[PDB]
């Protein structure tokens, strides 16, 4: 990247994309004991977006890095949360 702003953005956004994909794949998996609502990903993804977007107000490129870095952190959390939930439903029901 050599400090090129846009190249940094591309790198983080690729990680974000991987996280989003892993989360949609979990949710999609078909057993209705998990009970994920229809628009669950899209409503959570959006909520994460609006939260992280406040970081633009911090100013300039730095704001974007923090914003993109927040989206990544929130999605990584969402993903772990969902995995954990799936594991708990699995070992609790019969």
């Amino acid at each position: 990247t050599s400090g090129v702003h846009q190249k940094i953005l591309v790198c983080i956004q690729n990680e974000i994309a991987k996280s989003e994909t892993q989360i949609r794949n979990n949710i999609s998996s078909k057993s209705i004991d998990y009970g994920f609502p229809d628009d669950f990903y899209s409503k959570q993804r959006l909520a994460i977006h609006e939260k992280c977007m406040l970081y633009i107000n911090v100013g300039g490129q730095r704001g974007e890095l923090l914003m993109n870095q927040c989206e990544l952190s929130m999605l990584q959390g969402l993903d772990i949360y969902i995995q954990q939930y799936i594991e708990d439903v699995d070992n609790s029901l019969l």
Binding site: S2, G3, V4, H5, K7, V10, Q13, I16, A17, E20
Partner: peptide, 21 residues
Amino acid sequence: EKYESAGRGPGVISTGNGDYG
């Protein structure tokens, strides 16, 4: 400029990865 424009012309369009890219 090498950090901001990095030698891009004014027609340069890049598609973002991720739902909100």
